[PDB]
């Protein structure tokens, strides 16, 4: 009926195709429970959106400021607002917005109302897709755009994971590593940097130091799952 992740497989009984991006992929059956599926839907949406913003951010940061490594961009900004003032502002603002989102996740009819200016509120929406003031100028049909969102978001999740694992192995940014691959397509793969056989294991060493200073402390900067690296 609908396009599936495996063009010959049968989707699980709990994936009927109603959701955007529903391609019948749940081999572990994590979304079998109807209550867990709502939470995983919201987590997929926010992971997608965070990862899309983050991938676009790294790319545009690499283009505008190639002077700075995105993996090191946390300890190289030197803003006048210090580390902890920024951390406090971020903590409280993100706490507010994420607790609001969480309260919409639990009891959906709860939080559409502005807590200051009562005249403004969101229309009755679906969980994960607030709408209202969050969505001016929706260009076209909403279903196809939800599908587009979740597809670009899955791609961007994999893209951020790739940024991480190509910045730990190569030590270079996304476009820098892309040019590294284009300048040597057959030698700069992960297959051409690494190989395990029954008798030896060659893993790529990390280009990220194990610790960095950042103002009088030593932040542990570990490779993600080195050792399990091929």
């Amino acid at each position: 009926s609908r396009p599936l992740w495996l063009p010959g497989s049968t989707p699980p009984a709990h994936l009927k195709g109603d959701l955007p991006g529903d391609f019948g992929f749940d081999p572990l059956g994590l979304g079998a429970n109807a209550e867990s599926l709502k939470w995983f839907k919201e987590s997929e949406l926010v992971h997608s959106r965070w990862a899309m913003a983050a991938v676009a951010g790294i790319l545009v940061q690499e283009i505008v400021r190639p002077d700075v490594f995105w993996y090191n961009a946390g300890k190289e900004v030197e803003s006048p607002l210090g580390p902890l003032g920024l951390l406090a502002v971020e903590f409280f603002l993100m706490h507010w917005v994420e607790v609001r989102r969480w309260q919409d996740l639990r009891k959906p009819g709860s939080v559409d109302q502005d807590p200051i200016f009562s005249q403004y509120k969101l229309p009755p929406h679906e969980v994960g897709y607030p709408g209202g003031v969050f969505a001016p100028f929706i260009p076209g049909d909403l279903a196809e755009l939800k599908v587009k969102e979740i597809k670009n978001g899955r791609l961007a999740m994999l893209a951020f994971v790739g940024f991480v694992m190509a910045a730990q192995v190569t030590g270079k940014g996304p476009i820098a590593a892309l040019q590294e691959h284009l300048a040597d397509p057959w030698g700069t793969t992960i297959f051409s940097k690494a190989a395990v056989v029954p008798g030896q294991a060659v893993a790529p060493p990390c280009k990220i130091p194990a610790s960095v200073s950042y103002k009088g402390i030593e932040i542990p900067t570990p490779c993600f799952l080195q050792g399990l690296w091929p």
Partner: protein, 227 residues
Amino acid sequence: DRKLWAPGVVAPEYLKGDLAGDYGWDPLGLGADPTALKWYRQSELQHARWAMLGVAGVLVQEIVKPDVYFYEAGLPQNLPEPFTNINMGGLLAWEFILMHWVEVRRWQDYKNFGSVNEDPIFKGNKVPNPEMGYPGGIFDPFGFSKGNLKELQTKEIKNGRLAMIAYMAFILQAQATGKGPLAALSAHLSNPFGNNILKNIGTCTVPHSVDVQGLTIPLTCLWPGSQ
């Protein structure tokens, strides 16, 4: 199923000649499960076709360039000039991905028969499927089928069984006497009593290991003896 593999044997009641090259052999009873019989026919076709390609490749590679050992042709320093000392990692990547695609497609044709026939990009093009293992269409472009299909399947599977035996023969000869197929044949014809499987079995000419761009491939022989 007629004219079985032995004069006095009976065919098992699941081998009745509906498959090509059915001599009713199955002495281990592995095809008693029909699921397993389907899967084993597919694996038989895969081993057969890959072994026909393999014997063809070893033979034509020894005939075109006898300068190169087929047992050592996989080494990157023995590769042709456009590919000599190529990075085996990127090569293995090309192969891994391009074969994962096609073999997963074939496997999904095994699981759900007739579900991966259509092209997934240009959805106007459908490979047919008379049988599982015989796609046809773009895989049968000359159109030798839509004729005697059972007889051609029989020819295919017979030559494929022979090619499997012949390639394992090539491999074991290369491990024993250190020579290719035709080199071993000419070495037999040079002295057909002092150069045969006697005085050559028991000695494995394969090294204990081979360094390939940093890796050490363990490089075993199919039987023990003399390094």
